[PDB]
Structures are given as C-alpha cells and as structure tokens.
C-alpha cells in the first residue's frame, strides 16, 4: 500500500472506510506462466 | 456454518487428544456422573481423571456440574434419595444411579492441580432469571416444580474454577452460629472487602459495625501481608466476596463459600 503521502480527491489511502479482509476464497494471483510449448503453437 | 464449529467423536476422559484442541472456557454439564457410573468408578477418581486431562489444555475457566452436597444430607422423597454409607444418589423418576463426593476432596484436588486458582460455587437458588429461557420459549411453568428444582440444585451445584485467581483460605467451622475465619493474602492496608448474600450487601470492612451479620472483625498483618477476617453467621447459604483495591471503580472478585445449618438430630 502507498505510504508517506495522502491524496483524497478520488482514493484516500490514509482515510476511513477502507477494508482489509484477506480470505482463502479471494486469494491473490497474476499471470505466472502460460502454454508456449513448440508442438502446440505451430 | 459461519464460524468454526467442530464435532469430534471420542471419549473425553481418554488421553492423547487434549494437546491439539483450541479453547479458553470449558463446559461440562450433566455428563460426569453418568460417565463415572458407566465405567464403575468412584466420583473422586472421575474428577481426578478429568482434572488430569484438563491440566494440559489451554483453558482459563472451567464450568463443571458436580455431584456434591452443599448443605446437610437430606432425601427429597420421590425425586432424589441419598445413600450415605455407600455414597450414592438414586433418581427414581428415571430409575438411575450415580455416585457422589464431598467438597473437601474436590477442593483439595483442584488446589493440588492449580496452586493459585479460585473456586466458586455458582449460586442459582433464589434467582428467577433462568425463567427467561422458559417463558420466552412458549413453555408453561409452575411454582411447585420450581421449588423442587431449587431443592435438587442444592445438591448438584456448578463448580466454577478460575485458573489464574486469588488464593484464600478457610479456617473455622462454617456452621450457623460458630466461629469461622478467612485468611486472604496479597493485599495492602488500604484495601476494602464486602460480602454478598443473595444480591444484598451482607457486610463490608469500610464500616464494620454497620454490618448485618451477628459478629464481624478484621485485622491486618504487615509482616505476612495478610487480612484475617473473623465472622459468626446466622443464615445458611452461599456467600460471595469482593475486594476493592485503591481507588478503582471496577471491583476484583474473589471466590465464594458455603455456610451450613446446624445438626438435625431430634429425640423425645
């Protein structure tokens, strides 16, 4: 999370009313790996 | 379910499982007597085994329904019979049988297990708050049944053990009219005590002569750092104690004790 600065026009990092509720169902993911095998692309 | 709700299929008096459960307050109601009768063992051995398994737990408060008299031994004809030679509660409405023991043994066991615990005998007689669980459930009550329940609870109290509590000791014979003493450690010369008997202030130490008990006195010893209370009671029952320390508005609660009626032997 951002730090050492606050901006409230749109999203106040340091303001009230924000939620920090980690859960098993929500988890966290990006794009780690794909399918780039030579035989399947052609 | 929404929060953790676990069900386990195993006897609780067996070893090898209390290391791995998470809990702070332990509840055991209307199970110990039947379990001890099923395995054909004395109530002392059953309580010793239960305390042994609960020693290794992480609990803070223990609430156990116990077979033990908190008054003179008398029989309630038709609902409970007491056999004293062979310590034995018999329940004729259900045709059942269970053993029982005395306050001294259970207190000694708990004091051995937890050297600085506080034992209280939960007072439920004379109280009408539990009726909130009956009238609000569309259930019809009667007064005579309530009285029978009070008289049965007189011999099946709830023992509440607080593991990290304030030790105190009993000296005299807690009988109506006799001399009984309390020895309370861990307090200073500015502290205050007050006792409660059925939601009414029986006596205090701020104003000794303004008490409602036949004779009360209090002394302090500085070398031992102890409070000595000498009392002579008039009414049997269960009394609770509280302590006020310094200028605090929240009072620290001590245990409770039981005052018994005189003998019932009559002749002509």
């Amino acid at each position: 999370m951002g730090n050492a600065s606050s901006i409230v026009q749109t999203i106040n990092v340091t303001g009230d009313g924000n939620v920090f509720k980690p859960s098993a169902e929500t988890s966290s993911t990006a794009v780690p790996s794909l399918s780039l095998s030579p035989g399947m692309l052609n | 379910w929404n929060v953790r709700t676990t069900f386990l299929e195993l006897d609780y008096l067996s070893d090898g499982w209390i290391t791995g459960v998470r809990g702070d307050i332990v509840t055991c109601m209307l199970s110990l007597g039947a379990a001890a009768a099923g395995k054909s063992m004395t109530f002392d051995a059953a309580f010793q085994q239960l305390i042994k398994v609960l020693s290794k737990s992480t609990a803070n408060v223990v609430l156990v329904q116990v077979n033990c008299p908190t008054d003179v031994v008398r029989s309630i004809k038709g609902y409970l019979e007491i056999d004293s030679t062979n310590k034995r509660y018999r329940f004729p409405k259900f045709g059942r049988d269970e053993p029982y023991s005395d306050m001294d043994a259970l207190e000694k066991i708990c004091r051995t297990a937890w050297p600085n615990c506080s034992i209280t005998w939960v007072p439920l007689s004379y109280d009408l708050r539990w009726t909130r669980l009956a009238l609000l459930e569309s259930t019809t009550l009667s007064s005579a049944s309530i009285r029978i329940a009070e008289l049965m609870y007189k011999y099946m109290p709830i023992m509440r053990i607080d593991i990290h509590g304030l030790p105190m000791e009993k000296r005299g014979n807690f009988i109506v009219g006799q001399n009984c003493s309390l020895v309370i450690p861990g307090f200073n010369a500015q502290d205050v005590f007050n006792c409660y008997f059925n939601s009414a202030l029986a006596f205090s130490t701020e104003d000794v002569n303004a008490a409602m008990i036949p004779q009360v006195s209090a002394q302090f010893d500085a070398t031992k750092g102890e409070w000595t209370l000498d009392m002579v009671f008039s009414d049997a029952g269960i009394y609770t104690m509280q302590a006020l320390v310094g200028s605090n508005a929240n009072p620290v609660s001590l245990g409770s004790f039981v005052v018994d009626s005189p003998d019932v032997d009559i002749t002509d």
Binding site: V31, S33, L34, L36, S37, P38 | -
Partner: protein
C-alpha cells in the same frame, strides 16, 4: 461436451424421465458403421466376406482430442517427400472425415444426459478411432532411420544461433557435409528430399529456383520461433514461463503447510522415503545416544554364558565390564549391517583369524546393568554369525580383519510383546564351540566396527531415539544440539523436516537472484516479524534497530537458510531458531511465487544477453573457418 450419446426409446418427443432414454448405437446412426468408411487409406478389406457387420457403441469426441490428433497428422506431413518415395500412405488421414455429426442427448449417465440436449455433436466408434491411430502410428514407424539421419545432418554443424544472424556460403556447407556425413546415411541416397525437408524445418535454409529465380523463406513454424526468440532486452517468454512453473511445482511438492503446522500431524503423513546411516557404537557417548545400554564399569568379575541358535548348536561367550547392548524396543523396524574391516582385535593371548563373531538377542525382565553370574540372562538365542580372516596390515608387525557384512533384520511384530516388563537387547561378540577363557580374551565386545542402519518402514517416526505417533512440525525448530543430531536414528523427524525444507530452498534459489546484503521479496517476511517482535514487551533489555539493519539481518538469515538447510533444526541458531520466522517465510513463499507476471531479474537478464552475444560471435568465427577451409568454386 464428452461422454456418450443417448436417444429416446421411441417416445413422441416427450422425455420426462431418465427411464425413457437408451444409449445410441451404430444401428441408430448407420453412417458410423464399418462398411460406410471411405477407406481412402486402403485399410478396410474390399472383400465382402471379410468385413464384419455387428453393432458397436458410440462415444463423443471433444475438441482437445480433435486438435491434438490433427497436429499428430501434421507431424507426419513434415516428411511427405520420403513417404512418397516409399509409396506409403499416399493420402492424408484427415481425422475430420471420420466423425459423424448428430443432434442427440450427451452425457455419462441417463439422469445427467436427460437435462442436456445438444445439437451437432461429433461421435465415432472405437473401431474407427483405433484404425486411425494405427495408420498414424505405422506411418511414424516407417520413418525412424530417416529421422535419425536428418537429425544428424542438422546437428553436425550449428544451424541455430542464440541471437542475431550469421552467414556462410552454402557450397562450403555442402562440401563439409559431403566430407563428414556417414556412408550409411540415407541423405547421400536421397539428397533433394532431405534438402526440402530441412528447408521446411529451418527457415535459415533457402533454395534458389532454377526456373524462375525467387528465393524465399519457406519454413512452416515461424510463430513458435517467435515464442522462443529473445528480444534485444529480455530473455524469451517460454523459458521464463517454464522456470516459474518448475518453481511452483517444487513448492507444491514440498507441502508448505505440513512443515508449518502448529497442531499434531500423524507420522505416515509426515514421513518420506528415508536413507541409511552409519555409526560406531563403541565411540558413541551413552548420555547422547539414548538407545544404548552399558553394564557398569570397574566390575571385576567376568562371567560366561552358553546359548543355542535355531539349529540347536551350542555356543560359548563371555560378558565382562564395559559390554554394551542396544535397546530393541520402541525403535520401529530396522535393518542392521555390521562391518569389522580394518580393525585388529589382536593380543598375545588371542588371535582373531579363524574365530567367529555373531549377533545374540536377549529377552529378560532385569535391566542390562544388573547382570552377573549368568542367572539373569533369561531367554536368548544366536541369530547370525560369520567367520573372520586376517591379512597383513600397513603398520609393521600387525594384521587386520577382512571385510564382513553381518546382517540382521528387526521386525517388532513377530516378538510377543506380551509383558511390558520384558526387555529386549542385541549384542555382537565372539562365539566359539570351546569356552573362551577370560584371561585370553579381554575385549568387552566387537562393537568397534562400522554399523549401518536402514529403516524397514515408511510410516514410522521417532524423536531422539523413541517412536512417536504424531509430531508438531513447529515444535522441532531450534531444538537439536549438533551432538544430538549425529546420534539420532535414520527414521528421525529432523531428517524428514530437513529434506522437505530443502525443496523450498531449491525453489527460492531458482526464482531469486540477489547478491550479498540485498533485499528480495523472499526475505522481507522475516523483516516484518523482526520489527513487530522488537517492539513488543517480554523480559530483558530491549534494543531498537532501524530499517537498514533489519533488512541486512533478514537477508543474511535467508542466505544462511539457503546455503545450509538444516539450521532450522539446529539449537541456538541466530535468527532462524524462532518459529515465527520459519512460519512467515514458508507461508510467504507461495504468495511471492504466485504473483509473478511473466518476469525475471535484472542481473539474470543482462548476464544472459551478454552471454548470448558472445555465443553468436563464436559461432560466426567457426562458420568463417568452415567457409575458408572449403572454398566455393
């Protein structure tokens, strides 16, 4: 969708129960039969007496299978020229001409299939699928030697450069390839076919056309090449994906949650295939090895006993002060091998050559220390024995014992274990058909020899020398001194935990590339814990450190873990002994790996690009050599 097709049992389009559906067959769809096959491959016989006419079922073919078999056929199409040369499979199989498209019910069971009506699903019989697989497999079988020779031709000289481009006149390449290629090769017999196949496989090779003149790229696999190619600033995409996936697989195999549990975990779930261990029983210290026993020393009355093996032969042996035995109770099954090679056991009054050494097992209710006069021995028999041999020794005027492999298996199930009072012991010593006089033989035993133990089970775990039913993995951290680790049994829990954590260490090293005293995403989990812990209140003097010192300490902790993965077990470890740091690191590894987005490290990328450019330079030099020593006309 997959499964099988289903049809109504004849009802008037009113199917309101799974009892009105029956599985479709080839009679209900006559085009799926064996006689309606187009038979372009010539496989099905044309004689009418040989083609069977029976009812076969139908199955549904899914898109994954369609695409993969369609690419399997193009694998064959890479070699059409040679396949033409041998008159093999003149017409392409064309999988899509075998399926039949039907509007039906689709499913595995009738209850599911009833509520699922689909249109234009492709079905096939098992027989035609088997025939198609056989045709491709035979075409593949006919090309083994040709493919091997083609690969030899491609790999004889470098046809691929890691980055950039290189060049050489093709006449020089052809001269070299004529000079060096083997005579057995089919390239020499069929040159043009090989040239066309290589031009299809490799985009570098381009053949000029005599009739017209245009020379152009003709490879058919450019997209895969671009997926493999490196940009001039980053590594290839596929390599990054492969590396990250391998690291994720290692983390998954290591079971990060098992090795971080705060509640008891059963022994079979915690265990892994173990390894044997070696010891010297005489050199061990009894207060460290909790699994040995020893008769009290300074005893001045040696005694002799007799004992018989399972063939009834009687044997004499003697126990004295200092004799050691091994507890055979509460250690799980185990195999012992004892080897005395290199030791002397030579005195003036006794020579080992020709003597016999044996394993002897004792059962008694009396502790081994309180033994004397042979009355306390109890029931006992000889298990195994072997005869020694002596050879010259490097030290002058001495001799040594040749090798042995005295073996014994201990299986706790067979022995009765009826009385908990009963004790079991094992010993190795000299035995002989004549009584051994105490003056001649003074050695307490022959335990001065190498001893290998190998576990005989995979669901048994001990701690410090006694078996347990469950373990708490978070309670093994920082609880072993080094002396207690060289005296544990091979089925110990410490070894299991160390081997499991080695996979986490390998994954972190694979993913991370950081120098000394540099922060990494895999070392901040320790840092947060250190900060919060140093703020708290315990007992003793508090010390406050800034963020730089904490970052350096956390990085050093992670490095000390990676280099030596057994520090978590070791007692009094600097920072890794605390269980919070171990749990935080183990939990944070998964989150750190799962949120990479096709990336790598800066140091890796820069070094990789420099290396590849050096490789192209060397390749170009070699090609200049080839073009210079094989002149073009």
């Amino acid at each position: 969708p997959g499964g099988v097709p289903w049809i109504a049992v004849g009802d008037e389009t009113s199917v309101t129960s799974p009892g009105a559906l029956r599985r479709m067959t080839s009679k209900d769809i006559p085009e799926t039969a064996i006689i309606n096959t187009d038979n372009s491959s010539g496989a099905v016989p044309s004689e009418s007496a040989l083609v069977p006419y029976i009812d076969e079922p139908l199955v549904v073919v899914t898109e994954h299978a369609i695409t993969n078999f369609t690419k399997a056929e193009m694998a064959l199409e890479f070699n059409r020229e040679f396949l033409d040369k041998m008159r093999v499979l003149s017409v392409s199989p064309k999988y899509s001409d075998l399926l039949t498209y039907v509007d039906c019910y689709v499913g595995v069971s009738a209850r599911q299939a009833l509520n699922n009506f689909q249109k234009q699903v492709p079905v096939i019989t098992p027989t035609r699928q088997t025939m198609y697989v056989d045709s491709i497999q035979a075409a593949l079988k006919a090309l083994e030697k040709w493919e091997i020779d083609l690969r030899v031709a491609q790999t004889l000289l470098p046809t691929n450069v890691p980055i950039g481009e290189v060049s050489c006149p093709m006449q020089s390449v052809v001269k070299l390839l004529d000079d060096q290629l083997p005579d057995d090769s089919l390239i020499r017999r069929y040159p043009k076919e090989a040239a066309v196949a290589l031009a299809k496989r490799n985009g570098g090779i381009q053949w000029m056309d005599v009739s017209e003149g245009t020379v152009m790229n003709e490879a058919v696999n450019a997209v895969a090449a671009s997926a493999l190619a490196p940009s001039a600033s980053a590594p290839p995409l596929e390599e990054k994906s492969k590396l990250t996936e391998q690291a994720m697989d290692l983390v998954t195999a290591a079971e990060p949650e098992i090795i971080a549990s705060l509640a008891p975990v059963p022994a079979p779930v915690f265990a892994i295939p173990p390894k044997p261990a070696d010891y010297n029983v005489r050199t061990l210290r009894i207060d460290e090895a909790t699994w040995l026993r020893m008769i009290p020393k300074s005893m001045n009355t040696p005694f002799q006993i007799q004992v018989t093996d399972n063939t009834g032969t009687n044997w004499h042996l003697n126990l004295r002060g200092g004799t050691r035995v091994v507890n055979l109770d509460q250690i799980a099954p185990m195999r012992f091998v004892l080897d005395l090679g290199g030791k002397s056991y030579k005195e003036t009054s006794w020579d080992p050559n020709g003597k016999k050494v044996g394993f002897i097992v004792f059962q008694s209710k009396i502790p081994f220390e309180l033994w004397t006069a042979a009355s306390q021995i109890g029931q006992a028999t000889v298990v195994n024995y072997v005869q020694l041999y002596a050879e010259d020794s490097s030290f002058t005027a001495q001799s040594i014992i040749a090798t042995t492999s005295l073996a014994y298996n201990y299986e706790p199930e067979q022995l009765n274990k009826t009385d908990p009072e009963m004790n079991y012991y094992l010993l190795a010593t000299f035995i002989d058909s004549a009584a051994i006089t105490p003056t001649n033989m003074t050695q307490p035993d022959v335990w001065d020899a190498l001893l290998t133990m190998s576990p005989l089970s995979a669901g048994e775990v001990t701690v410090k020398g006694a078996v347990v039913s469950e373990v708490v993995p978070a309670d093994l951290i920082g609880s072993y001194t080094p002396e207690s680790l060289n005296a544990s049994l091979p089925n110990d829990a410490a070894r299991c935990m160390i081997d499991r954590a080695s996979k986490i260490a390998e994954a972190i090293k694979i993913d991370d590339d950081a120098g000394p005293d540099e922060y990494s995403p895999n070392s901040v989990p320790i840092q947060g814990q250190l900060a919060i812990s140093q703020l708290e209140t315990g007992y003793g003097v508090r010390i406050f450190n800034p963020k730089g010192i904490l970052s350096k300490i956390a990085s050093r902790a992670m490095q000390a873990f990676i280099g030596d993965p057994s520090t978590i077990i070791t007692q009094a470890a600097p920072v890794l002994s605390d269980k919070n740091n171990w749990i935080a690191l183990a939990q944070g590894v998964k989150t750190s790996l799962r949120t990479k987005s096709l990336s790598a490290g800066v140091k890796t990328a820069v070094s990789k690009l420099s290396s590849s450019e050096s490789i192209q330079n060397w390749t170009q030099g070699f090609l200049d050599k080839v073009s210079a020593h094989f002149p073009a006309p």
